[PDB]
Amino acid sequence: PEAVTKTVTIDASKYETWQYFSFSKGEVVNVTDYKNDLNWDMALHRYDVRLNCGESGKGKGGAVFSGKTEMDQATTVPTDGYTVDVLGRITVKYEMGPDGHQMEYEEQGFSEVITGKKNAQGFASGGWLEFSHGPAGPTYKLSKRVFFVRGADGNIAKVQFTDYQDAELKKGVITFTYTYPVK
Amino acid sequence: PEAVTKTVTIDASKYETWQYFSFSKGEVVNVTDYKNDLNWDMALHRYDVRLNCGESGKGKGGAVFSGKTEMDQATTVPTDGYTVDVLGRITVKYEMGPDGHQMEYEEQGFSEVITGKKNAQGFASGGWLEFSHGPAGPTYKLSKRVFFVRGADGNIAKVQFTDYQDAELKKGVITFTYTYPVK
């Protein structure tokens, strides 16, 4: 199989569910027992990313950071050391308005490599999306970190996330480009 | 009056109230009608800072950033341009439950110069404290920015905030040093 590149946007704005994605199909797929299903490679929920490995599934998944922020510079693919998913805090319900919010969370599996490591309130650093500071107030910045990501069957995608909101600034609409399979 | 320097720690961990402080007295003072009370100069709430001016009070207060991060470098005191408090989102209740929480907000006066400008999720930038990237997860970091701050009567303090939590990591326990009055 030759390396195919696709740019994908997925609406992961809902808090209650994840959007499951197949590298080989290039499509969102329906998943009803994610921990025992090899038909998905990566899942998205808000700014969280899950892989089919570790605490999130029974597959051969995992992820590394290439050290690059340009996909065209990440040309050597590692053969080992694809860190697997761990448990962390996921927001599963969020009600908000001008006067307050109420939220609920669950401990679930996710990829710290891609998501970043979370603080006690679930905000993350070191992955695809970072807090950024400037005089107009803090924003999210795309880190542009380029990941290598094993899918459920172990074949590797090169993945870079490039947006976290749509053109109307609806948050949790995620865009990424991936090239798959690579070796 | 000669310039006096004091290091102060105030427990501003409660969400429901502000801690009001007098520069001249070097002490916390009790305040109810804060918008009509010249006996306070600076108030603390969590990581928020309020001055007796603008949307927060009828006084002659306000603030500037000196451009310095060392108090001993901020030796020329501006005579004009002390920005006054504006309205923004203040968290006035936080209630934890076993698997989630609830927060309530109010729009109140605060100093953007010292607090930082807030985004739509309430994170501030450009003031004394910034929620920021790190390899173990995101954390608040001290900017060490040195401010000049007019009190209610217009007399100026040099102020630098140097901690946001106590030794047990209790959040919202604020340490600052100030020198007052300066000209």
Author numbering:
A (entry chain F), B (entry chain A): 34 to 216
Article, verbatim:
P. gingivalis is a heme auxotroph, therefore it must acquire this compound to survive and cause efficient infection establishment. Amongst well-characterized heme acquisition systems of P. gingivalis is that encoded by the hmu operon, comprising HmuR, a typical TonB-dependent receptor involved in heme transport across the outer membrane, HmuY, a heme-binding protein, and four proteins with unknown function. The work presented here substantially extends our knowledge of P. gingivalis HmuY by presenting data on further structural characterization of this protein and novel data on a second member of P. gingivalis HmuY-like family, Tfo produced by T. forsythia. The comparative analyses of HmuY homologs suggest that not only the HmuY hemophore-like protein of P. gingivalis, but also T. forsythia Tfo may be engaged in heme acquisition.
Our crystallographic studies have revealed a unique β-fold in the HmuY–heme protein structure and confirmed bis-histidine heme ligation. Compared with holo-HmuY, one can see the opening up of the heme-binding pocket in the apo-form. This loop must close up when the heme group enters the pocket. We experimentally verified that heme binding was accompanied by a movement of the loop carrying the His166 residue.
